[model samples]
Target chain A: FQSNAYLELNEIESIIKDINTKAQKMHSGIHKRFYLFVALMTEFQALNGMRIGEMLAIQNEDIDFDNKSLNINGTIHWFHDESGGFGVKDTTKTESSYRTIGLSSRSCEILKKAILENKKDSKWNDGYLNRNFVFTNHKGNPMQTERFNKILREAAKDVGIDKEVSSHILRHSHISLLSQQGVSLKAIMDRVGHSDHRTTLSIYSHVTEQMDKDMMNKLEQVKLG
Target chain B: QSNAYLELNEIESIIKDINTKAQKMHSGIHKRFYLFVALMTEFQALNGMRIGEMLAIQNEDIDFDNKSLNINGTIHWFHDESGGFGVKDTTSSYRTIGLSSRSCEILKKAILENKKDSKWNDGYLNRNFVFTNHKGNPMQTERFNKILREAAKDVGIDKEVSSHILRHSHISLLSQQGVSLKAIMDRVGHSDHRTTLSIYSHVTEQMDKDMMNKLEQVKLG
Candidate 1:
């Protein structure tokens, strides 16, 4: 919970756009595919407050196009062993995190695009080891977990973003947006699962404090001089 | 604010002190724990990037051919409530600044030395990070700060002298040289115009104090 890290709704828009634009420019190979993978993951995360592990754990089967609900049952866990890699578990990190949540209509559309790109990525890379997970490395391996932040920071740096960024910021940003919009208190808490309720409340209070600061910024424009 | 900065002469003293220690170890690996501290200290004094921004600099960020650095981000450390070590995001921090030929040599020696030691070790210290630990992970900021404080201590200058002091000292040096207030703000990524005045006030106050000291030496004859 790097509480300071999340983007505003508008900053989110700019970073996603910058990421997509960069992805569009890359002609081919690991860089473009992985860049787009993080972009899609970040895109989906922006709209929903899912934790990075659960987000990385997603598969084609977990999505529900008809009802627009996503199954929140599984999450990726890293083991210290020298074996293959992290395997997605049916349970999540936090208790009650197993519950399902609805997606934005655009999120559903983004999922389709993401899945199509995932398939295209599998088509090109013989080294890609895992097609089961939503995100992958250059060799088509499951996401390294650590590498997501590495990719994200570099991308954010490339695009001139100047805050410490990580995947968690999206989760932080998502809850802030919901709280700011006056969504039902109980619903917002339960939607993100478990203790996330308290987390949302914390941010709701934080947003309240920030509003005063934002107003101060607005008043600074009066140009009394 | 000025208290946080070392006078230029004081910085030179600290630099000499660290170099003297580095020369004693003058050889290799874990010595970087102390040795690289000097390199890092020197680099920070020359360039005014925040410690986080300096740690985040990767090899590619340096344009040695052009003598410029693209300081596009800062590395958030692993401690704390959340977020592991990764590039901290920024807009104001994403500016390019000149790299002196002297600074470039410091950087080259650091990477080449890391390369030899790295190749013999695990990932070949091909570690992309400009300032790296023996393992090539970005050197811990806490450790770096601690080393800097000790180095400053040995120089007999009794200031905190953490990594950020270098940033302030660099700006203060620039200020002393008649660098514009605006240029200072932009180069150091101060978003608020008034935020920089802490340094401005300190420099003037130090200037005023210096004048008072000169007057005291006149003996009122």
Candidate 2:
């Protein structure tokens, strides 16, 4: 599968600029919240190299709030069109994709703050129980990709992105930032769970301004230079 | 929203109206001549066929047994520098669309009922296309647009919709009917679900409620 990833640094800054503003006005809808959280977490994890489905599968029972680590019993499931099948499991494919992503001290505090605030809300507790799953709808159903993408796009529009964006853009944004920081390709690839090396290169192929300068410096090795 | 399908009856009514109007006109390209325009309307509505795909279509692409058309080839070259087979090409998007019964009936009726012009056989072959101009040439996309403008006025229609909007409407209708997204993707020949989702998001509220529900929890959670 070709990677659909591209975002100029300016475009990213513009998006991030809108994130907080849009985050405030967003409606209290299950699909919408999951969309934003997933969009944020997908990027957050991508930058950090943790699997989204793995993280999503974690229940309230699995997390150690004091330690700031979440445990997952197993991998997640999705419909794979290429196979024309469903529930295809891979301990190798699924397991390797699952790994603990240690949260920064600040990130941990953010999660704790959210948990406290969520419990305080009457409407949420009346209708749903937030357990095991870190993210859920009001009724606590699992979030879907379509519903997630829709909410994310609307949120992006609310914030300031003009081009139609999707949840995957957040994932790409994560990798793009890391790749620019001179992170080793192998390390990024392993973290992001790129099944193929070409997949990683094709995505981060848009080199940064710094990368271009560094490449130009390699001109010193050419005898003609 | 991906799979783009149309009711068989709606297509038939359009074809019938087109044939009746086409019969009333002089057989040359003119202010009143409408057969080319009518054919383009029908052609544009067919599945997984782009302008390039339509142009790429050859006489041999027809499947007589299947009563369908195979869309293939490029009318123009891809702009990407990788000029060869895999260069800056759009995806290879050839697809076979089942003929609408009405369209099939119209084409069959034309085969039996069309009054042949004397010069028509000179450059046009019966198998060339069901829709062609006075010269039996494949209709140019631009020319189709002009005809569409006239046709829009002819029907006393007021909306600013184009042939492509009809395509969008077709996709929206299919998606709303709960057609499988992948099937729609195959039908439209779009590369990814995300692209189609963006394109059809306007017609969908499934995203809206789902997101709000999740977001509300976030504020509280």
Candidate 3:
């Protein structure tokens, strides 16, 4: 609950650079898609407070290029059948989880690039009710979260990020950054879809501590002056 | 993450619903399926075990006399692998966890029932795994996770239910019952004290409002 390990902005950039280097080293098409997927997903998570499930559930229709926003109304959950085969379900964690996020220029650029790449990839096909999902596996189905996380771990290792970097870390990092920038607590809470103010406040504590230290330093400087 | 702790009644209703469904199942497989999921959910919420760690538990890990479990490993799927069964975080996580009498009783019954089931097999490399698939292999967390999620939905619980959420709920529940943060940390097998404190010390939105109201009352007094 101490907010699992997150990366500094520099570490995130290094991981992105490492991913690109690794992507170039590989010639396989799937490998290329994998690298791009991880890079785009990491960037999206850092910019938006979308859960991996919610991100996976996004469809092409959810994106509004005109408004630069994306709707997050559902999540893609994996369920196992009696025969041991797993399938995906489009559902959200809670009703309040249904919200739209306005995209920044950086996130919008990534999405635009992803859309272009998705058009060229004929191998992976969208399977969810014939709707084209923003992200898909090689077979065109909604991307599996486990496989994505495994790739993320590898990317982190390639970049020499010693911490256990995962999808949630990006979400935490987003919240931390927003809090550090002096965003309103209620706004942060809404962005993260946290129904409780306490949850938002708890995460804010890490950023709040730094602010406390900075404020104290400024006070001391004034006294010295 | 609203401090969505399951009330005593909610817990009981889930147990009752599972038991009712399990009893109606005529096939051995269906019965085991229902029972296994129920056991996993209860165990996690009560003991604060991680999903992977819970699934990795084996029959030999249970110490009936001491009422303990060995929190030594995690079970997870590997890329390019068929089945997931392995020991991870081998050093700091390797510790024995004491069980409550209730949990001890439930586990004892589960072990006995598993042995009696005809489909139960112990010949796989992960033969000792407490939970098994239809073919008697170490059960995947994915399947168990689905069952728990569906069960939570069935019982009309609005909160997101997963092993991690249940673990947090467990810590909050324990704290509500006046359990010490140190005790909860040990029970959850977390090496970092902050992990336990962060969760247990999280003030609920309702709690914050309550404190504010108390301030108003104190001023009037």
- DockQ by candidate, in order: 0.01, 0.01, 0.01
For residues B12-123, what per-residue lDDT tens digits would candidate 3 score against the true structure? 6676677777889998677877877777667777777777787777787889887778888876454224344443334366778767666776677666665665244543
CA-based DockQ, model 1? 0.01
State the lDDT of candidate 2 residue by residue for A1-225, as single tens digits: 122354444554445445444556667654345544554543334333344455445555665767656544454476442533332223354445554444444445445544554455434466554443454445443345566566556656776666656655655655665555444455456545654456466555554333443431332221100
The count of residue-pair clashes in candidate 2 stands at 26
Q: Candidate 2 docking: what grade? A: incorrect
Return the candidate ranking by TM-score, descending. Answer: 3, 1, 2
lDDT of 1: 0.67
What tens-digit string does per-residue lDDT give for candidate 1 at A1-225? 334657776666667677777778897766777677777777678777888878877888889889878887776666522445545344635455777877666777778876776687578766655446665666545576567688777767777778788887778887776654434345565667664556666776676445433432332222100
C-alpha TM-scores of all predictions: 0.44, 0.37, 0.45
Question: Per-residue alpha-carbon lDDT of model 2 for B110-181, expressed as tens digits?
Answer: 333223631344534332433444444444566666656555555555545355544554455434433434
Q: What is the C-alpha RMSD of each candidate to the true structure, in Å?
A: 27.0, 21.3, 26.2
Model 2: residues with Cα > 4 Å off, grouped in runs: A1-4, A8-23, A26-52, A61-75, A78-95, A121-124, A157-164, A204-225, B1-221
